[PDB]
Amino acid sequence: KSPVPGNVIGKGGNAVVYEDMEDTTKVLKMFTISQSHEEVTSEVRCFNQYYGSGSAEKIYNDNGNVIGIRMNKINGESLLDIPSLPAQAEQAIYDMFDRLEKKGILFVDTTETNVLYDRMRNEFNPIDISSYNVSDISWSEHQVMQSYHGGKLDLISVVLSKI
Amino acid sequence: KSPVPGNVIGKGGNAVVYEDMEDTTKVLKMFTISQSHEEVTSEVRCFNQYYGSGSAEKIYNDNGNVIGIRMNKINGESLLDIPSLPAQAEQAIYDMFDRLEKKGILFVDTTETNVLYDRMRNEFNPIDISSYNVSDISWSEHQVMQSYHGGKLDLISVVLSKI
Protein backbone atom coordinates (compact mmCIF):
# COMPACT_ATOMS: atom_id res chain seq x y z
CA LYS A 1 0.00 0.00 0.00
CA SER A 2 2.87 2.42 1.03
CA PRO A 3 4.31 5.18 -1.18
CA VAL A 4 7.83 4.44 -2.59
CA PRO A 5 10.03 7.55 -2.67
CA GLY A 6 12.90 7.96 -5.10
CA ASN A 7 15.32 10.85 -5.16
CA VAL A 8 14.64 14.25 -3.81
CA ILE A 9 13.07 16.76 -6.20
CA GLY A 10 12.25 19.64 -3.90
CA LYS A 11 12.15 20.90 -0.35
CA GLY A 12 10.13 23.31 1.70
CA GLY A 13 9.53 24.27 5.29
CA ASN A 14 6.85 21.58 5.71
CA ALA A 15 7.66 18.77 3.28
CA VAL A 16 10.13 17.08 1.05
CA VAL A 17 9.13 16.14 -2.46
CA TYR A 18 10.44 12.83 -3.81
CA GLU A 19 10.01 11.04 -7.09
CA ASP A 20 7.43 8.27 -7.01
CA MET A 21 9.44 5.19 -7.98
CA GLU A 22 6.20 3.32 -8.74
CA ASP A 23 5.07 5.98 -11.23
CA THR A 24 7.34 8.23 -13.28
CA THR A 25 4.54 10.76 -13.89
CA LYS A 26 4.03 11.41 -10.18
CA VAL A 27 5.84 12.83 -7.18
CA LEU A 28 5.42 12.31 -3.43
CA LYS A 29 5.14 15.38 -1.25
CA MET A 30 5.89 13.96 2.17
CA PHE A 31 5.11 16.26 5.09
CA THR A 32 7.79 16.58 7.75
CA ILE A 33 5.30 17.61 10.40
CA SER A 34 1.56 17.30 10.78
CA GLN A 35 -0.57 19.69 8.69
CA SER A 36 -3.98 21.12 9.20
CA HIS A 37 -6.89 19.54 7.47
CA GLU A 38 -7.79 22.85 5.75
CA GLU A 39 -4.32 23.31 4.38
CA VAL A 40 -3.91 19.79 3.09
CA THR A 41 -7.40 19.85 1.61
CA SER A 42 -6.85 23.19 -0.07
CA GLU A 43 -3.55 22.07 -1.54
CA VAL A 44 -5.10 19.06 -3.16
CA ARG A 45 -8.21 21.00 -4.27
CA CYS A 46 -6.20 23.82 -5.88
CA PHE A 47 -3.88 21.38 -7.62
CA ASN A 48 -6.74 19.32 -9.04
CA GLN A 49 -8.59 22.48 -9.97
CA TYR A 50 -5.68 23.74 -11.99
CA TYR A 51 -4.21 20.60 -13.47
CA GLY A 52 -7.42 18.51 -13.62
CA SER A 53 -9.30 16.05 -11.45
CA GLY A 54 -7.02 13.17 -10.40
CA SER A 55 -3.82 15.32 -10.45
CA ALA A 56 -3.38 15.07 -6.62
CA GLU A 57 -4.53 12.70 -3.95
CA LYS A 58 -3.79 12.40 -0.27
CA ILE A 59 -1.50 9.68 0.99
CA TYR A 60 -2.54 7.98 4.18
CA ASN A 61 -0.87 5.77 6.73
CA ASP A 62 -2.50 2.71 8.32
CA ASN A 63 -3.95 4.95 11.08
CA GLY A 64 -5.88 6.87 8.40
CA ASN A 65 -3.85 10.07 8.90
CA VAL A 66 -2.50 12.10 6.01
CA ILE A 67 1.29 11.79 5.58
CA GLY A 68 1.69 13.42 2.12
CA ILE A 69 0.26 14.06 -1.35
CA ARG A 70 0.84 12.14 -4.57
CA MET A 71 0.69 14.52 -7.49
CA ASN A 72 1.56 14.89 -11.12
CA LYS A 73 5.17 15.56 -11.91
CA ILE A 74 4.91 18.95 -13.62
CA ASN A 75 6.66 19.72 -16.92
CA GLY A 76 9.18 22.52 -17.28
CA GLU A 77 12.45 23.89 -15.94
CA SER A 78 12.64 26.36 -13.00
CA LEU A 79 12.20 29.95 -14.12
CA LEU A 80 15.05 30.87 -11.76
CA ASP A 81 17.51 29.09 -14.00
CA ILE A 82 16.21 30.54 -17.28
CA PRO A 83 17.91 33.85 -17.85
CA SER A 84 16.20 34.46 -21.20
CA LEU A 85 12.70 33.94 -22.57
CA PRO A 86 11.16 34.17 -26.02
CA ALA A 87 8.59 36.91 -26.74
CA GLN A 88 5.64 34.51 -26.85
CA ALA A 89 6.16 33.77 -23.16
CA GLU A 90 4.45 37.08 -22.27
CA GLN A 91 1.14 35.65 -23.37
CA ALA A 92 1.93 32.38 -21.61
CA ILE A 93 2.26 34.02 -18.21
CA TYR A 94 -0.98 35.94 -18.66
CA ASP A 95 -2.57 32.64 -19.66
CA MET A 96 -1.46 31.08 -16.42
CA PHE A 97 -3.09 33.80 -14.33
CA ASP A 98 -6.25 33.75 -16.47
CA ARG A 99 -6.60 30.02 -15.82
CA LEU A 100 -6.01 30.39 -12.10
CA GLU A 101 -8.49 33.25 -11.88
CA LYS A 102 -11.28 31.39 -13.69
CA LYS A 103 -10.99 28.63 -11.19
CA GLY A 104 -11.34 31.30 -8.42
CA ILE A 105 -7.78 30.78 -7.18
CA LEU A 106 -5.90 33.86 -6.10
CA PHE A 107 -2.40 32.52 -6.52
CA VAL A 108 -0.29 33.41 -3.50
CA ASP A 109 3.25 32.33 -4.05
CA THR A 110 4.15 34.24 -7.19
CA THR A 111 7.95 34.02 -6.69
CA GLU A 112 10.02 32.76 -9.66
CA THR A 113 10.99 29.71 -7.65
CA ASN A 114 7.46 28.55 -7.60
CA VAL A 115 6.92 28.35 -11.28
CA LEU A 116 8.24 26.17 -14.09
CA TYR A 117 8.43 27.21 -17.75
CA ASP A 118 7.96 24.58 -20.39
CA ARG A 119 9.77 26.15 -23.33
CA MET A 120 8.64 23.37 -25.67
CA ARG A 121 4.91 24.12 -25.09
CA ASN A 122 5.39 27.76 -24.15
CA GLU A 123 3.57 27.33 -20.83
CA PHE A 124 4.02 28.43 -17.25
CA ASN A 125 3.16 25.83 -14.67
CA PRO A 126 2.80 26.74 -11.01
CA ILE A 127 4.21 24.29 -8.51
CA ASP A 128 2.80 25.01 -5.05
CA ILE A 129 -0.70 26.34 -5.61
CA SER A 130 -2.51 27.99 -2.79
CA SER A 131 -5.02 30.77 -2.64
CA TYR A 132 -5.66 33.81 -0.56
CA ASN A 133 -8.75 33.29 1.64
CA VAL A 134 -11.00 36.00 3.03
CA SER A 135 -12.04 35.64 6.72
CA ASP A 136 -13.88 38.18 8.88
CA ILE A 137 -11.02 37.42 11.31
CA SER A 138 -7.78 37.55 9.29
CA TRP A 139 -7.94 38.62 5.63
CA SER A 140 -10.37 41.24 4.19
CA GLU A 141 -11.19 41.54 0.47
CA HIS A 142 -9.18 44.68 0.19
CA GLN A 143 -6.09 43.13 1.87
CA VAL A 144 -6.43 40.12 -0.37
CA MET A 145 -6.89 41.94 -3.68
CA GLN A 146 -4.05 44.28 -2.86
CA SER A 147 -1.61 41.43 -2.14
CA TYR A 148 -2.89 39.29 -4.94
CA HIS A 149 -2.48 42.08 -7.51
CA GLY A 150 0.99 42.95 -6.23
CA GLY A 151 2.19 39.40 -6.63
CA LYS A 152 0.79 38.98 -10.04
CA LEU A 153 2.32 42.14 -11.42
CA ASP A 154 5.54 41.17 -9.79
CA LEU A 155 5.75 37.78 -11.44
CA ILE A 156 4.67 39.30 -14.72
CA SER A 157 7.37 41.96 -14.47
CA VAL A 158 9.90 39.19 -13.81
CA VAL A 159 8.76 37.42 -16.95
CA LEU A 160 8.90 40.65 -18.99
CA SER A 161 12.42 41.27 -17.75
CA LYS A 162 13.63 37.99 -19.21
CA ILE A 163 12.37 38.78 -22.71
CA LYS B 1 -3.09 46.14 19.32
CA SER B 2 -3.17 44.55 15.73
CA PRO B 3 -0.02 43.82 13.70
CA VAL B 4 0.79 46.54 11.12
CA PRO B 5 2.24 45.13 7.88
CA GLY B 6 4.47 47.15 5.59
CA ASN B 7 5.82 46.05 2.22
CA VAL B 8 6.16 42.48 1.16
CA ILE B 9 9.48 40.79 1.99
CA GLY B 10 8.75 37.18 1.06
CA LYS B 11 6.17 34.66 0.03
CA GLY B 12 5.51 30.99 0.53
CA GLY B 13 2.76 28.45 -0.03
CA ASN B 14 1.20 29.20 3.35
CA ALA B 15 2.10 32.81 4.23
CA VAL B 16 3.22 36.16 3.15
CA VAL B 17 5.97 37.92 5.06
CA TYR B 18 5.61 41.66 5.53
CA GLU B 19 7.75 44.28 7.23
CA ASP B 20 6.46 45.25 10.70
CA MET B 21 5.85 49.01 10.36
CA GLU B 22 5.79 49.34 14.14
CA ASP B 23 9.25 47.78 14.52
CA THR B 24 12.08 47.88 11.99
CA THR B 25 13.81 44.89 13.56
CA LYS B 26 10.81 42.60 13.04
CA VAL B 27 8.75 41.05 10.27
CA LEU B 28 5.26 39.67 10.17
CA LYS B 29 4.72 36.22 8.70
CA MET B 30 1.03 36.28 8.01
CA PHE B 31 -0.57 32.91 7.22
CA THR B 32 -2.93 32.76 4.24
CA ILE B 33 -4.74 29.75 5.61
CA SER B 34 -5.16 28.15 9.01
CA GLN B 35 -2.13 26.23 10.35
CA SER B 36 -1.92 23.30 12.72
CA HIS B 37 -0.94 23.94 16.29
CA GLU B 38 2.07 21.60 16.04
CA GLU B 39 3.45 23.24 12.94
CA VAL B 40 3.09 26.78 14.17
CA THR B 41 4.50 25.76 17.57
CA SER B 42 7.44 24.00 15.97
CA GLU B 43 8.18 26.98 13.80
CA VAL B 44 8.32 29.42 16.69
CA ARG B 45 10.29 26.91 18.86
CA CYS B 46 12.93 26.35 16.17
CA PHE B 47 13.26 30.01 15.44
CA ASN B 48 13.68 30.93 19.11
CA GLN B 49 16.04 28.03 19.63
CA TYR B 50 18.32 29.17 16.87
CA TYR B 51 18.12 32.96 17.16
CA GLY B 52 17.39 33.21 20.93
CA SER B 53 14.39 33.39 23.20
CA GLY B 54 12.06 36.23 22.16
CA SER B 55 13.02 36.00 18.44
CA ALA B 56 9.54 34.82 17.41
CA GLU B 57 6.10 35.07 18.96
CA LYS B 58 2.69 34.08 17.74
CA ILE B 59 0.17 36.65 16.58
CA TYR B 60 -3.45 35.87 17.50
CA ASN B 61 -6.90 36.91 16.42
CA ASP B 62 -9.89 37.41 18.71
CA ASN B 63 -10.77 33.71 18.34
CA GLY B 64 -7.43 32.89 19.99
CA ASN B 65 -6.15 31.33 16.75
CA VAL B 66 -2.85 32.01 15.30
CA ILE B 67 -2.76 34.24 12.24
CA GLY B 68 0.97 34.74 11.94
CA ILE B 69 4.31 35.10 13.64
CA ARG B 70 6.22 38.23 14.52
CA MET B 71 9.93 37.50 14.22
CA ASN B 72 13.31 39.13 14.03
CA LYS B 73 14.22 40.54 10.66
CA ILE B 74 17.27 38.44 9.86
CA ASN B 75 20.48 40.00 8.62
CA GLY B 76 21.92 39.14 5.21
CA GLU B 77 21.28 39.09 1.49
CA SER B 78 19.75 36.05 -0.29
CA LEU B 79 22.38 33.49 -1.24
CA LEU B 80 20.60 33.16 -4.59
CA ASP B 81 21.72 36.60 -5.61
CA ILE B 82 25.32 36.22 -4.44
CA PRO B 83 27.27 34.67 -7.26
CA SER B 84 30.60 34.78 -5.43
CA LEU B 85 31.66 34.10 -1.80
CA PRO B 86 34.92 34.63 0.10
CA ALA B 87 36.89 31.59 1.32
CA GLN B 88 36.01 32.09 4.99
CA ALA B 89 32.40 31.41 4.14
CA GLU B 90 33.14 27.65 4.06
CA GLN B 91 33.59 27.65 7.82
CA ALA B 92 30.54 29.85 8.24
CA ILE B 93 28.22 27.31 6.63
CA TYR B 94 29.61 24.47 8.74
CA ASP B 95 29.05 26.78 11.74
CA MET B 96 25.44 27.18 10.86
CA PHE B 97 24.85 23.41 10.76
CA ASP B 98 26.81 22.87 13.97
CA ARG B 99 24.59 25.37 15.72
CA LEU B 100 21.37 23.80 14.37
CA GLU B 101 22.52 20.31 15.31
CA LYS B 102 23.41 21.29 18.91
CA LYS B 103 19.94 22.59 19.39
CA GLY B 104 18.65 19.19 18.12
CA ILE B 105 17.26 20.66 14.93
CA LEU B 106 17.64 18.61 11.73
CA PHE B 107 17.28 21.43 9.25
CA VAL B 108 14.97 20.43 6.49
CA ASP B 109 14.88 23.21 3.91
CA THR B 110 18.44 23.40 2.81
CA THR B 111 17.76 25.15 -0.51
CA GLU B 112 19.73 28.35 -1.29
CA THR B 113 16.56 30.42 -1.27
CA ASN B 114 16.04 29.57 2.36
CA VAL B 115 19.33 31.03 3.59
CA LEU B 116 20.79 34.52 3.89
CA TYR B 117 24.49 35.36 3.98
CA ASP B 118 25.69 38.31 6.02
CA ARG B 119 28.92 39.13 4.31
CA MET B 120 29.84 41.75 6.91
CA ARG B 121 29.80 39.16 9.79
CA ASN B 122 30.57 36.14 7.59
CA GLU B 123 27.50 34.27 8.79
CA PHE B 124 24.79 32.12 7.26
CA ASN B 125 21.32 32.67 8.65
CA PRO B 126 18.48 30.26 7.93
CA ILE B 127 15.09 31.80 7.27
CA ASP B 128 12.39 29.16 7.59
CA ILE B 129 13.64 26.73 10.22
CA SER B 130 11.93 23.43 10.62
CA SER B 131 13.15 20.03 11.65
CA TYR B 132 12.72 16.45 10.53
CA ASN B 133 10.70 14.56 13.11
CA VAL B 134 10.72 10.81 13.74
CA SER B 135 7.19 9.40 14.17
CA ASP B 136 5.36 6.03 14.35
CA ILE B 137 2.99 8.02 12.14
CA SER B 138 5.63 8.21 9.26
CA TRP B 139 9.38 9.05 9.47
CA SER B 140 11.91 6.46 10.72
CA GLU B 141 15.37 7.34 12.02
CA HIS B 142 16.98 5.92 8.94
CA GLN B 143 14.69 7.90 6.58
CA VAL B 144 15.36 11.07 8.55
CA MET B 145 19.13 10.80 8.80
CA GLN B 146 19.38 9.91 5.11
CA SER B 147 17.38 12.96 4.02
CA TYR B 148 18.95 15.25 6.58
CA HIS B 149 22.49 14.38 5.47
CA GLY B 150 21.64 14.71 1.79
CA GLY B 151 20.34 18.21 2.29
CA LYS B 152 23.23 19.31 4.34
CA LEU B 153 25.83 18.14 1.83
CA ASP B 154 23.79 19.69 -0.89
CA LEU B 155 23.74 23.16 0.70
CA ILE B 156 27.39 22.87 1.59
CA SER B 157 28.24 21.96 -2.01
CA VAL B 158 26.32 25.03 -3.18
CA VAL B 159 28.38 27.21 -0.85
CA LEU B 160 31.61 25.57 -1.98
CA SER B 161 30.63 26.24 -5.58
CA LYS B 162 30.46 29.95 -5.01
CA ILE B 163 33.96 30.19 -3.56
TrEMBL record, chains A, B:
Protein name per Swiss-Prot or TrEMBL: T3SS secreted effector NleH
GO biological process terms, semicolon-separated: effector-mediated suppression of host innate immune response
Domain Kinase OspG kinase: residue ranges: 8-130
Full-protein residues shown: 141 to 303 of 303
GO molecular function: transcription regulator inhibitor activity
